[PDB]
Design a protein around this ligand. Structure first.
Ligand SMILES: CCCCCCCCCCCCCCCCCC(=O)OC[C@H](COP(=O)(O)OCCN)OC(=O)CCCCCCCCCCCCCCCCC
Ligand SMILES: CCCCCCCCCCCCCCCCCC(=O)OC[C@H](COP(=O)(O)OCCN)OC(=O)CCCCCCCCCCCCCCCCC
Ligand SMILES: CCCCCCCCCCCCCCCCCC(=O)OC[C@H](COP(=O)(O)OCCN)OC(=O)CCCCCCCCCCCCCCCCC
Ligand SMILES: CCCCCCCCCCCCCCCCCC(=O)OC[C@H](COP(=O)(O)OCCN)OC(=O)CCCCCCCCCCCCCCCCC
Ligand SMILES: CCCCCCCCCCCCCCCCCC(=O)OC[C@H](COP(=O)(O)OCCN)OC(=O)CCCCCCCCCCCCCCCCC
Lengths: 481, 71, 85, 83, 124, 89, 52
């Protein structure tokens, strides 16, 4: 199979010359395969189901059935399945959004994009700390290369930011993982809630883990790399980064931190709430005085992640469900806004300064409708998944701490301010003098945006449709005596 | 006559209307239900309840007069 | 709706000037007449006239342009150049 | 009145003074779809409709309140303000 | 140049024109501009805090000074609230005693219980 | 309809993962049953209120008090608190 | 618009609009009269409910 499929790949490359059709086909097959897996997934059980092990000593190149397990573990539960489905949904759209604007070394570009997508998808399958960390860092070289070669004018500094900040956080994560390894001599996620470390040791390990979470989510005050890396990334890099790599952080909290360091998490929760309220308020305010389109869209994601964090550390089932739903809805909506600003407007006019843009409704009414819909979705209109996520997250946060959650309810207003201030200038007024008329949104762009819009609407009208995968998870991590 | 607690529940009188002549409230509300709350109808029953409330408020103004006189 | 014609503008302006009192004469008002010279209007009287013209046609004259019109032809052409008149 | 407008601009709302030459036949189609959708949903949502009162009996209500009292007595439950 | 926040930025510019910012809303609207709606001509220099002085900026009103408008706002509120509060004193007394209800104020019908009749129950 | 057998954390040796998983799942399922009891209470209260209207206070006092009582205790609380702590000591 | 700076002609208004005006005005005035007659004591304030 693998030999034959490799032959097929080689022949397609030799004859056609551009791998991108093969990659699109492949990613669609992967999506279908994951859907088949969902069909055969038992939901009346809190146990990992499609388990396999790699690089075991008895079978380094195959799967292990040995009675000693020294390789890397993989498997899924409902929580991993949700994000995996999101990933396989997003990857083909990431390939498709750059279908025409890459005219050089295109095969390498598509290879990097598909590789990053596969790395994240595999990362969600990881079942122990070491493999999780391995696949968690494996993206950074690919992101560095991609941003450096296929990025905009300031792409060199962008690539250095995206590598350095994430390494900086990941190495403290590595300290915590090394401490866990040498203290427990185990690394798995299957039974790691069974080990009850001393409170002081929990308090120490929690620091490294949460520093990694601060850099990767990001949270205030170490969020300054994200707006850059977004603004100078090419479209696929921005869509992947906004839609999957940030959710890797939330998945990291739920999988690595909460089951193992429960008591220390209980001790540290108000500090988390300080940091999340900081990120929400301060980044939302800082968004008001930006002049770049992609930078503003990037700043939106940080605030939504702040609300997600407030949900996920609320020690309530509603808070956790809200954090997950908000993560999924953000993965639907933010790639769409990035598609607009960095693939439609940027590919037509090759500029991102806000002053140039005005009154796009006259020549491009369809693009204006899309902007309006996506912006009201981003600020949390009900019947959109974003609203369900923000509402449930805020419920959990208000329960966990009434004052802090009540103040956090100002995020609704702040989000409306920056987003609608942007869309007001973009859609209306008299058509700009600086730019000329160009085509309206095309069939491909409309297809991608329709996919994202219908996904967010579907989970916004009936968020319950996710519950069958998540009803174990909403109880697996809350710590009430 | 003051209505029975059972009767007053059975007719589902509003709490604020449950007084010494909810007895006249019951037929008035029944009339108001048969007609469609039209202003011209239920005249007799409406006047009857109002004349209750006249007597009712009258005993009240006299009670406040007595209270005032004490001071 | 309602649309004006150059001759309509000219007729309204002629009637306007006819009813103004500080004018020298009514018959001498020509299409190319100079208010300053022919009709002998004061510094301020032509100002009163331009205010009357804007009040009549329902427009607003900037300071730099009001003082620029010196003849009735200039006034008629200016009023015909503005779409909402 | 009116003014020139670019003809290439396609909007699902129709753009400027959209008044298609076959508008009466498209209108027949539209009203057919309208009556179809309205009637279908009016019939489909019929089973989920009910009145507010008269659904359950006094028997059920009183027995449920009595059961609630039984529960509150099995546990040690005083009333509000009962102190 | 004029405002404190623009003055704050003067050390932070190096070789960029220190522009005096003028609210674009207050530029008279009868001059001609390349973009009439924004009242800007092409290649006009931009103040560092431009986004606070363009047309899209929050509207500014010229009639009263800001401080003076604050004085008026606070004055209206104070006079209204104080006049109402002092008027509360010079109030006539009513003529009819408040109404009462049977069964010790229907404390049974508004829930209530024998042990707690003060929480639920009318004037009786 | 599945009725998996109930297991408790107190009896089990934490080194047999099958039993530990069963204990976790049993605890969760019992919490969900308690939720169903709370919802049944609430639905009965809604029907009571809607049919009693003005005298809903007297008619529904018991249900209202019971619902308010079971609210703080019949939610989810998750198993980590009880498996990671032994209440005896 | 034949005359300028001169007395204006009597406005021309449609028959229907004059008839609508007459009907609306007649109805409002008649309704107001009927209401005052029917409610005079209560709306003006009479028959004090206090004891003499
Ligand atoms: C460079 C970064 C660091 C690299 C570290 C790790 C590199 C790993 C390389 C990728 C290989 C993993 C994917 C293939 C392994 C799974 C093969 C398999 O057969 O699944 C095993 C599992 C159980 O199967 P079995 O027990 O045999 O019973 C069959 C009953 N009919 O059967 C199943 O349940 C199905 C399991 C589905 C797994 C989905 C995997 C998602 C992505 C697949 C391709 C990913 C390739 C990644 C490339 C980039 C590198 C990360
Ligand atoms: C920076 C970049 C880092 C790159 C990291 C990627 C590392 C890739 C290592 C690949 C090993 C993992 C392969 C996943 C296992 C999938 C599989 O089962 O392949 C079939 C075969 C063994 O299959 P078997 O053990 O019989 O189990 C199936 C029973 N139903 O498997 C085989 O026969 C072996 C064929 C794979 C040979 C790979 C050689 C290296 C690639 C060049
Ligand atoms: C390796 C095994 C897994 C690969 C999976 C995909 C296989 C097919 C890749 C492909 O489609 O072609 C890749 C690329 C394009 O081929 P081509 O069109 O010939 O290049 C243009 C100039 N000839 O071929 C190339 O152009 C190669 C150019 C290489 C670019 C140099 C910098 C990229 C470095 C990648 C970062 C890797 C860091 C590793 C660390 C951990 C990563 C997991
Ligand atoms: C619940 C979900 C409901 C989803 C509704 C489905 C969307 C279908 C309708 C969109 C088409 C409207 C449109 O095309 O507006 C374009 C409009 C310019 O169109 P026009 O007026 O014809 O011409 C003026 C200059 N050419 O340009 C504009 O002025 C923009 C106005 C957009 C109106 C969109 C209506 C939807 C508003 C709800 C958004 C909620 C998001 C959550
Ligand atoms: C009691 C206190 C009242 C609080 C009310 C809520 C404040 C937010 C309202 C923001 C707003 O509406 O500004 C809209 C502004 C349009 O105002 P304007 O230019 O005057 O409109 C001309 C139309 N004739 O357009 C704009 O200026 C948009 C630019 C951003 C506006 C908000 C700036 C943030 C400042 C803090 C807002 C409040 C923070 C939370 C309180």
């Amino acid at each position: 199979i693998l030999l034959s499929s490799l032959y097929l790949f080689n022949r397609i490359l030799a004859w056609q010359g551009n791998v991108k059709h093969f990659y699109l086909f492949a990613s669609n097959l992967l999506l279908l395969f994951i859907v088949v897996l969902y069909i055969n997934f038992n939901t009346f059980s809190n146990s990992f189901q499609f388990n396999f092990e790699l690089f075991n000593s008895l079978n380094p190149f195959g799967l292990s059935n040995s009675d000693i397990s020294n390789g890397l573990l993989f498997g899924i539960d409902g929580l991993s399945l949700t994000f995996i489905l999101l990933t396989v949904l997003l990857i083909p759209l990431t390939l498709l959004g750059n279908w025409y604007n890459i005219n050089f070394n295109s095969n390498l570009y598509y290879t990097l994009v598909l590789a990053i997508g596969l790395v994240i998808l595999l990362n969600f399958w990881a079942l122990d700390y070491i493999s999780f960390y391995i696949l968690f860092e494996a993206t950074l070289p690919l992101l560095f290369i991609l941003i450096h070669i296929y990025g905009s004018s300031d792409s060199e500094r962008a690539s250095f930011y995206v590598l350095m900040f994430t390494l900086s956080g990941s190495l403290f994560m590595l300290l915590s993982i090394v401490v866990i390894s040498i203290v427990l001599n185990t690394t798995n996620f299957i039974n790691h809630n069974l080990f009850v470390l001393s409170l002081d040791l929990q308090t120490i390990i929690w620091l490294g883990l949460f520093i990694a979470i601060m850099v990767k989510t990001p949270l205030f005050p170490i969020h300054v790399w994200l707006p850059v890396v977004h603004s100078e990334s090419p479209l696929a890099g921005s869509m992947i980064l906004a839609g999957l790599i940030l959710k890797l952080a939330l998945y990291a909290i739920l999988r690595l931190l909460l089951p193992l360091l429960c008591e220390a998490q209980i001790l540290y929760t108000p500090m988390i709430y300080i940091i999340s309220l900081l990120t929400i308020i301060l980044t939302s305010l800082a968004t008001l005085r930006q002049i770049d389109l992609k930078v503003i869209i990037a700043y939106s994601s940080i605030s939504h992640m702040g609300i997600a964090i407030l949900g996920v550390c609320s020690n309530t089932s509603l808070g956790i469900y809200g954090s997950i739903v908000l993560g999924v809805a953000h993965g639907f909506v933010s790639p769409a806004l990035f598609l607009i600003v960095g693939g439609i407007l940027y590919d037509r006019y090759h500029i991102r300064i806000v002053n140039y843009y005005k009154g796009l409704t006259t020549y491009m009414p369809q693009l204006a409708t899309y902007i309006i819909i996506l912006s009201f979705a981003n600020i949390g209109t009900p019947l959109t998944g974003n609203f369900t996520g923000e509402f449930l997250s805020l419920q959990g946060g208000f329960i966990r701490n009434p004052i802090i959650g009540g103040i956090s309810c100002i995020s609704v207003l702040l989000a409306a301010i920056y987003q609608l201030k942007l869309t007001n200038k973009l859609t209306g007024g008299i058509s700009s003098i600086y730019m000329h008329r160009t085509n309206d949104v095309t069939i491909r762009e409309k297809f991608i945006m329709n996919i994202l819009i219908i996904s967010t609407l579907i989970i916004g009208i009936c968020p319950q449709i996710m519950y069958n995968l998540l009803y174990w998870t909403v109880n697996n991590y809350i710590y009430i005596i | 006559p003051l209505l029975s607690q059972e009767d007053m529940k059975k007719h589902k009188i509003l709490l604020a209307y449950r007084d010494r002549c909810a007895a006249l409230l019951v037929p008035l509300n029944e009339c108001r239900k048969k007609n469609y709350y039209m202003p011209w109808a239920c005249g007799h029953e409406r006047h009857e309840y109002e004349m209750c409330e006249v007597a009712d408020f009258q005993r009240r103004v006299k009670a406040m007069d007595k209270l005032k006189a004490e001071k | 709706a309602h649309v004006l014609t150059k001759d309509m503008i000219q007729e309204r302006i002629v009637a306007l000037l006819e009813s103004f009192d500080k004018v020298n004469d009514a018959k001498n008002i020509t299409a190319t007449a100079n208010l300053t010279s022919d009709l002998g209007l004061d510094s301020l009287d032509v100002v009163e006239v331009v205010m009357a013209i804007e009040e009549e046609f329902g427009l607003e004259i900037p300071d730099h342009d009001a003082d620029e019109i010196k003849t009735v032809q200039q006034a008629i052409d200016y009023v015909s150049a503005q779409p909402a008149a | 009145g009116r003014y020139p407008f670019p003809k290439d601009v396609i909007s699902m709302t129709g753009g400027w003074w959209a008044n298609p030459s076959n508008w009466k036949l498209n209108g027949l189609f539209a009203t057919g779809i309208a009556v179809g959708l309205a009637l279908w949903v009016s019939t489909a949502t019929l089973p989920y409709t009910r009145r507010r009162e008269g659904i359950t009996s006094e028997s059920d209500i009183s027995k449920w309140n009595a059961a609630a009292g039984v529960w509150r007595e099995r546990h040690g439950k005083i009333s509000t303000g009962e102190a | 140049i004029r405002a404190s926040f623009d003055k704050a930025e003067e050390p932070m510019l190096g070789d960029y024109p220190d522009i005096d910012p003028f609210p674009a809303q207050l530029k008279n609207p009868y001059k001609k501009y390349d973009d009439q709606q924004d009242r800007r001509n092409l290649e006009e220099p931009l103040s560092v805090n431009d986004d606070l002085y363009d047309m899209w900026s929050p509207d500014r009103f010229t009639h009263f000074k800001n401080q003076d408008a604050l004085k008026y706002f606070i004055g209206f509120l104070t006079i209204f609230f104080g006049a109402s509060y002092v008027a509360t004193y010079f109030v006539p007394e009513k003529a009819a005693i408040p109404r009462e209800f049977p069964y010790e104020g229907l404390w049974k019908e508004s829930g209530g219980t024998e042990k707690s009749k003060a929480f639920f129950g009318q004037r009786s | 309809h599945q009725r998996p057998e109930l297991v408790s954390f107190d009896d089990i040796n934490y080194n047999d993962h099958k039993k530990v998983r069963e204990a976790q799942e049993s605890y969760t399922r019992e919490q969900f049953i308690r939720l169903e009891a709370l919802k049944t209470v609430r639905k009965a209260l809604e029907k009571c209120y809607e049919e009693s209207g003005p005298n809903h206070f007297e008619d529904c006092k018991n249900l209202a008090e019971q619902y308010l009582d079971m609210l703080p205790t019949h939610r989810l609380q998750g198993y980590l608190g009880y498996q990671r702590n032994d209440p005896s000591k | 618009n034949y005359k300028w700076n001169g007395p204006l002609p009597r406005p021309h208004v449609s028959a229907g609009h004059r008839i609508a005006t007459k009907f609306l005005g007649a109805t409002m005035f008649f309704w107001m009269f009927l209401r005052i007659k029917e409610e005079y004591p209560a709306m003006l304030g009479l028959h004090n409910f206090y004891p003499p």
